[PDB]
C-alpha cells in the first residue's frame, strides 16, 4: 500500500507527542453532506455498503472538504448480524430493523458458525483495500465494528430501543444463552476485524453504542469480558500472521461508569461521550491510554465563533498529550458542513497554540 | 440536434475552401471576461465542471460578445486523471495540484480500469449535450481532452513544472511503467472522446500542452505513439457505432520539432504555438493538413489597430487555404475583451480581403 504521509493520528493513538492534536468526526461521511445524499440516492444502504467504489467515494468525500487527520471506512455495524444469518430491512425515516429478532434460546440455531462470517464480509475488505489505495497515504484509514453487547441488542430488540428491555431481560432471565450469543459475536468479530487490517485498515474502533443501558454490574458481567477478548484476540492473530497490530479504540457511549475498566481492557484509546468532563475522564483512565472525543455534536449548531471557543475550552481540559479530538457521538443529518470545518480548523489552531 | 447553420470551421478543418477564415480562441471562456468571474464565483472549478448548466453558460458567454466561428465546451483537462481515481485540489492563486502524485510503479495500482472512466465522466457528456442544444446550430461545438504525455506529467509531477524533471525521470528510469501509464491514459481517453462526440461534440482537440519539454527522441518514443493511437481508435469506434467521425485537432505547444510527424498522425488539423513561423510550419506539415493558430496571445495587449496589423501579417503568411485562425495559446486573465473582439473582427475582415 502507499506509504502514510500524515500519521499524526496514529502517533497520538499510541501516546506519542505530536505537533498538533489530530481530529476526525464520527459520521464524517454522512447525510449532513449534500454529496453524500446524492451518492446514496442510487442504491439502498446495505447495497451501497456492498459496492467498494461507492464506499470509497463516501469515505473520501469529507476529506475533500476538510483536512481531517483520519478517514473511517463507509460501512455498517449491522453487517455482522447480517453475515451471521439475520435478515435486516432498512425502513424509510425510521431505521434498520430485523423483522425476525432473536427471542428464545432456540433462535441461536439459525446463526452461522462465527468462523465463516469473515468470508461473508469480503465486500467490506474489498472496500477497505480500494479506499486505502485511493487515499494514497494522505491519512490513516480506520476500520470498525459494533461491540458484542451492542450487536446483541439489535439482534434481540430487532432495532433501536429507549430501554433495551428485551435484551436486558435476556441478561437476567437467560444468562447462559446471553453468554452463548455474546461468544458467537466475539468469535465473528475477531476474524472480521483482523480481515479489516489484512485489507489495509490502520486503526480499529469498536462501538459499544448501547453501553449506557447497563449499569456497572451488568456491564462487567456481560459487556466487558467480550470487549477485552476482542482486543486480545485481534492483536494475537495479527502478530501470528506476521502483521503489525494497529491501535484499537473502544467507544462506550454513556459508559462513564466503566471508564476505569475500559482503560485496562487492552485498547490504546478510550473514546468519550460529551457527558463526561475531560478532567474526570483523565482521572478515571489514568496516564497511559489516549482519550478520544468529546464535543457535544449539537455544539456544531452554534456559530463558528462559538464553536472555536468551545473547542478551545475542550482542548484546555484534555491537555496536549494522549488526546485525539472528535465529537462525543456522530454528526447529525441537519448539521452545516461549514460548522464541521470550523470544528476541524479550531482543533488544529488551538492545539498548536497550546504547545507554543 | 439542431442543424448547423455556420459550418465554416468544419469546412476549413477538413481542408475545403471557405469564403472567409474561421476563428476561435483557446480559453475564450475564461477569466478575462467579467461575466466568467461572476458565474464561477458560486462554485469551485471542478464543481462548476460538474454542472451542465454552468458549463453551458460559460461556453456561450464569449459568443454573446464576439462572432466566433466555434464554441469549445467548458471543462477541465484534469477530469481524466480525476476519473482514473486521483484526487485533485484547486489551490487559490497557485493552481491544480495532486497532493498524492504517482511516483513509483506500484502507484499505478490505485487507478481505475480505463474502460470505466467514460462512465465517471457522464457529467461532461451532459454538459456537451445541453450546450449543443442551447447553441441551436449557431456554430460547431468542440470537445477536448489532454494528450497522454501531458496528463502523465500532471499525474507524476502533481501539478505544473518548469522542467518536468520527475515525469522525464520516469521516461528514462521507468520506461516500462511509463508505457503502462501512457497506455492506461490512451485507453481512458478513447472512450471519453468518443462519448463527447456521442453527446454532440462536432470536433475534438487533444492538448499536448507539455510537448516542448521533450526533445524529438523522447517525443517519438513516448508521446507520438499514443497521439496516433487516440486518433485511430476514436475514428474506428465512431464509424463502428454508425456515427460520423469529426475533425480532430492536435495541439503540441512548443512542439516545433514534431510537426512533420504530427502531420502524419491522423489529425485533420495541427495547432501551432506562436514561436513557429507560419511559412515554416506549412513546409513541415505539407499541403493536406489544416493549420490552426497562431497569434502570440500577448499581442492582444497591443492597441486594436496594432492587433489588426499583426493579424493581417499572420494571415498573409498562412495564406487562405487549409487554415483556422486562433492564438498560439489560451487567453490570459488580464486581457481586454475588446481586444479579443478586435482579433476576431480582423481575422474576418482581412481573410475576406485576401480572397477578393
Ligand atoms: C440510520 C442508521 C444507519 N446505521 C445505523 C443507523 C441508526 C442510528 C441511530 O440510532 O440513529 C446504526 C449505527 N451506525 C453507526 C453506529 C455506531 C455509532 C454509535 O451509535 O455510537 C450505529 C449503531 C455508525 C456509523 N454509521 C456509518 C458509519 C461508517 C463511517 C461513516 O459513515 O463516517 C458508521 C461508523 C454510515 C451510515 N450508516 C447509516 C447511515 C445513514 C450512515 C451515514 C451517516 C449518517 O448520516 O448517520 C444507516
Ligand atoms: C488554472 C488552471 C485551470 N486548468 C488548468 C490550469 C492551469 C493552467 C496553467 O498552466 O496556467 C490546466 C489547463 N487548462 C487548459 C489546459 C490546456 C491548454 C494548454 O495548456 O495548452 C490546461 C493544461 C485549457 C482549458 N481551460 C479551460 C478550458 C475549457 C474551454 C474554455 O474554457 O474556453 C480549456 C480547454 C477552462 C478553465 N480551467 C481553469 C480555468 C481558470 C479555466 C478558465 C480559462 C482561464 O481563464 O484560464 C482551471
The grid coordinates of residue B314 equal 499572420
d(CA A112, CA A107): 12
- Whether ligand 2 lies within 6 angstroms of the CB of B154 is answered as no
B99 vs A contacts (CB less than 8 Å): 138
Burial grade of B247 (CB within 10 A; 0-12, 13-18, 19 or more): buried
Strand partners, A90: A96
A137 vs B contacts (CB less than 8 Å): 100
C-alpha closest to that of B195 among B151, B148, B143, B159 = B143
The DSSP call for residue A23 is B
For residue A269, which phi and psi values (nearest 5 degrees)? -130, 135
Where do we find the cell 445541453? B130
The grid coordinates of residue B240 equal 463502428
Give A156 Cα–ligand 1 centroid separation in angstroms: 19
Chain A: residue whose CA lies nearest to B47: A35
Ordered DSSP codes for A176-203: HHHHHHHHHHHHHHHHHHHHHHHHT-SE
Task: Find the largest Cα–Cα distance for chain B.
Answer: 62
Number of domains in chain A: 1
The DSSP call for residue A4 is P
Q: What is the resolution of this structure in A?
A: 1.7
In contact, B328 and B274? CB cutoff 8 Å: yes
C-alpha closest to that of A181 among A146, A211, A152 = A152
- Whether ligand 1 lies within 6 angstroms of the CB of A11 is answered as no
User: Beta strands B323-327 and B89-91: pairing type?
Assistant: unpaired
Chain A: residue whose CA lies nearest to B100: A136
In contact, B279 and B236? CB cutoff 8 Å: no
B85 vs A contacts (CB less than 8 Å): 134
In contact, A55 and A130? CB cutoff 8 Å: yes
Inter-chain CB proximity B110 and A64 less than 8 Å: no
d(CA B162, CA B300): 25
Q: Could you tell me the CATH number of the domain that includes residue B224?
A: 3.20.20.210
d(CA B264, CA B267): 8
Where do we find the cell 472512450? B191
Q: Which ligand is nearest to the CA of A82?
A: 1
d(CA B37, CA B28): 13
Ordered DSSP codes for B49-83: HT-HHHHHHHHHHHHHHS--S-EE----STHHHHH
B109 inside 8 A of chain A by CB:
yes
Chain A: residue whose CA lies nearest to B98: A136
Inter-chain CB proximity B107 and A136 less than 8 Å: yes
Per DSSP, helices labelled H in B158-223 are 165-173, 175-199, 216-218
| Exposure of B125 in the CB half-sphere (CA atoms within 13 A) | 15
Ligand 1 atom closest to A333 (CA): 46
User: Beta strands B89-91 and B95-97: pairing type?
Assistant: antiparallel
In contact, B58 and B40? CB cutoff 8 Å: yes
Strand partners, B290: B269
Q: Which residues contact A270 (CB under 8 A, 6 or more apart)?
A: A249, A250, A251, A259, A262, A263, A281, A285, A289, A290, A291, A292
Where do we find the cell 445524499? A37
d(CA A307, CA A342): 7
The grid coordinates of residue A215 equal 449499569
Q: Is A18 left (phi over 0), alpha (psi -120 to 50) or beta?
A: beta
B122 inside 8 A of chain A by CB:
no
A135 vs B contacts (CB less than 8 Å): 100
A160 inside 8 A of chain B by CB:
no
d(CA A250, CA A149): 13
Q: Find how far residue A50's CA is from the centre of its chain.
A: 19
| Virtual torsion, Cα B102, B108, B111, B112, nearest 10 deg | 160
In contact, A274 and A297? CB cutoff 8 Å: yes
In contact, A57 and A130? CB cutoff 8 Å: no
Give the residue numbers spanning the domain of B333.
Answer: 1-356
In contact, B352 and B18? CB cutoff 8 Å: no
Chain B: residue whose CA lies nearest to A67: B89
d(CA A330, CA A332): 6
Q: What is the CA radius of gyration of chain B?
A: 19
Task: Find the largest Cα–Cα distance for chain A.
Answer: 62
Give A296 Cα–ligand 1 centroid separation in angstroms: 17
Q: How many residues are present in chain A? A: 356
| Virtual torsion, Cα B236, B239, B242, B243, nearest 10 deg | 100
The grid coordinates of residue B122 equal 457522464
* Shortest Cα distance, chain A CAs vs residue B238, angstroms: 29
* Per-residue CA distances from B249 to A62, B293, B332 (Å): 39, 11, 22
C-alpha closest to that of A186 among A138, A135, A132, A150 = A150
Amino acid at each position: 500500500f502507499p506509504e502514510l504521509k500524515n500519521d499524526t493520528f496514529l502517533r497520538a493513538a499510541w501516546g506519542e507527542e505530536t505537533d498538533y492534536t489530530p481530529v476526525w468526526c464520527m459520521r464524517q461521511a454522512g447525510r449532513y453532506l449534500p454529496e453524500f445524499r446524492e451518492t446514496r440516492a442510487a442504491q439502498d444502504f446495505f447495497s451501497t455498503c456492498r459496492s467498494p467504489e461507492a464506499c470509497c467515494e463516501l469515505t473520501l468525500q469529507p476529506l475533500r472538504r476538510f483536512p481531517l487527520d483520519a478517514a473511517i471506512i463507509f460501512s455498517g455495524i449491522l453487517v455482522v448480524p447480517q453475515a451471521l444469518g439475520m435478515e435486516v430491512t432498512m425502513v424509510p425515516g425510521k431505521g434498520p430493523s430485523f423483522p425476525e429478532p432473536l427471542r428464545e434460546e432456540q433462535d441461536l440455531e439459525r446463526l452461522r458458525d462465527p468462523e465463516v462470517v469473515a468470508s461473508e464480509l469480503g465486500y467490506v475488505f474489498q472496500a477497505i483495500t480500494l479506499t486505502r489505495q485511493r487515499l494514497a497515504g494522505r491519512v490513516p484509514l480506520i476500520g470498525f465494528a459494533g461491540a458484542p453487547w451492542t450487536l446483541m441488542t439489535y439482534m434481540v430488540e430487532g432495532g433501536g430501543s429507549s430501554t433495551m428491555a428485551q435484551a436486558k431481560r435476556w441478561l437476567y432471565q437467560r444468562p447462559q444463552a446471553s453468554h452463548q450469543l455474546l461468544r458467537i459475536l466475539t468469535d465473528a468479530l475477531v476474524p472480521y476485524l483482523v480481515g479489516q487490517v489484512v485489507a489495509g485498515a490502520q486503526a480499529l474502533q469498536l462501538f459499544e453504542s448501547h453501553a449506557g443501558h447497563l449499569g456497572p454490574q451488568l456491564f462487567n458481567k456481560f459487556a466487558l469480558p467480550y470487549i477485552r477478548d476482542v482486543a486480545k484476540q485481534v492483536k494475537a492473530r495479527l502478530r501470528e500472521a506476521g502483521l503489525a497490530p494497529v491501535p484499537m479504540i473502544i467507544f462506550a457511549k454513556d459508559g462513564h461508569f466503566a471508564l476505569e475498566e475500559l482503560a485496562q481492557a487492552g485498547y490504546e484509546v478510550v473514546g468519550l461521550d460529551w457527558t463526561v468532563a475531560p478532567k474526570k475522564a483523565r482521572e478515571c483512565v489514568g496516564k497511559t491510554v489516549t482519550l478520544q472525543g468529546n464535543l457535544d455534536p449539537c455544539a456544531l449548531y452554534a456559530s463558528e465563533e462559538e464553536i472555536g471557543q468551545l473547542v478551545k475550552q475542550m482542548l484546555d481540559d484534555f491537555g496536549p498529550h494522549r488526546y485525539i479530538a472528535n465529537l462525543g457521538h456522530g454528526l447529525y443529518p441537519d448539521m452545516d458542513p461549514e460548522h464541521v470545518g470550523a470544528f476541524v480548523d479550531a482543533v488544529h489552531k488551538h492545539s498548536r497554540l497550546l504547545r507554543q
